[PDB]
Amino acid sequence: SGPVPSRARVYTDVNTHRPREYWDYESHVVEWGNQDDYQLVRKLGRGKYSEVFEAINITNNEKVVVKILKPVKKKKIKREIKILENLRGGPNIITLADIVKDPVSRTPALVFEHVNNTDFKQLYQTLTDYDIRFYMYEILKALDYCHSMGIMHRDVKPHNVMIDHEHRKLRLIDWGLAEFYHPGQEYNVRVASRYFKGPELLVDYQMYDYSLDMWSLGCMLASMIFRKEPFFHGHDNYDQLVRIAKVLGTEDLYDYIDKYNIELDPRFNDILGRHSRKRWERFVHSENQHLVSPEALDFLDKLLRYDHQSRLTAREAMEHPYFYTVVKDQARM
Ligand SMILES: [Cl-]
Ligand SMILES: [Cl-]
Ligand SMILES: [Cl-]
Ligand SMILES: [Cl-]
Ligand SMILES: [Cl-]
The missing domain is CATH 3.30.200.20 (Phosphorylase Kinase; domain 1)
Known part of the structure; x- marks a missing residue:
């Protein structure tokens, strides 16, 4: 009758198996x-x-x-x-x-x-293709770790990623919005910055999980390799979903909404209207294409999904071909 329940694909019962005082x-x-x-x-x-x-x-x-x-x-x-x-x-x-x-x-x-006072945003338009891949992988290490410890960050964005580029150290910071994941628990949708809010927050679906951080990560990656910050530039809450729909299309959005029996405000449907999915190549121009690869586009495509359950887990992302050489090269760190 109401919104269909959801569960995390991975790390679902981590906190349940922990002693009480942990979470x-x-x-x-x-x-x-x-x-x-x-x-x-x-x-x-x-x-x-x-x-x-x-x-x-x-x-x-x-x-x-x-x-x-x-x-x-x-x-x-x-x-x-x-x-x-x-x-x-x-x-x-x-x-x-x-x-x-x-x-x-x-x-x-x-x-x-x-840590050194230099975040990702002040830097993530200055370094090479390999550096983007490298630091993206470092972020995934942190995301896979905290998720495995039953914790959602819920505020992933380049401002919350400190980088000591000199020593190639990366730190995920600002855990003020973080929360423990518990199966079936309904969470506050007023988290993260607008530009990095996942579709679940924008449609008021509360039973979300770790995958929220993965969408945020996708937005970060999209902005870097396309040299467009922010990538989804909504001017208000409704517009944010509009900007996303203008890229991923309205078909997958409505399917996603129906899948979890989500109830949108009637006016929100007319606002969203009808949009066709845009190919990732359309955002590529001669001043960013050095950061673009077929691996990147496929990786990005696998992060930016409406369905939170369909998005890559941190671990799956880490072994995506996009990081193939990074992983190989790191094997002799
Ligand atoms: Cl609690
Ligand atoms: Cl930011
Ligand atoms: Cl919450
Ligand atoms: Cl936009
Ligand atoms: Cl994960």
Whole structure:
């Protein structure tokens, strides 16, 4: 009668097999450190979500990064912390060193191990075809890892990918939107940035999973190899789905909607209208074609699917021909 249930193709029961305290962050008691152990050196970033600083740990004289958290509910604080601690040590994941509160203002702050202040977006139009493939693979390492640990990032975008290009290190950051995947659980669709929102969020389908991150990844890849940021440039929530439909076509969208018995606002159907699927070659021009290959296009085609269950898992993506030489070359890192 209502929306048909969905389940993740992989890593479905990971949290179920874990002990309760692994995923139950509300019951987790946060062990706070001392803010006095850290002194701020200089400001790095600034937004609606955080204030980021270069800082020093006076106890061992180590360079660290401090993120002053904007006042969100304690539940969101505990969730990010618990997730970061569970993922700590994982490949290409940011490393939470400590957690502190201001002695006076009580404002929480996250302390990470040092990374260089250069994200993917400032760089992902400057490097070669092999570098795109290389870093895309590094992102997949992180995505496959956190997914295998039962965690959805839900905010994949080049701004949340720090790259130390000098040492070819990559870190997936900003786990403030991340959440644990539990079979049958309905999640908030107000996650991720508009340009990177998957079709599931735009049609208000709540029983999504890890595959949400894969769509976001597809959008990132599309923008790079086509030199178009963002690739899907919706001016509002409705328009975002329109921009996607103008590329993937309306046929697969309506099939997807019917498949899960999704109910759209009646006016949304007329807005979407009818559009034919566009071939990926149509976005290729002489100023980006050096980043384009048949492997790339097929890989992208296998990420950007309306049906979240049809999208490649992180692991399947990692062994796609697109990364063939990268994998071979990495085998002698
Ligand atoms: Cl929970
Ligand atoms: Cl971004
Ligand atoms: Cl949620
Ligand atoms: Cl567009
Ligand atoms: Cl996955």
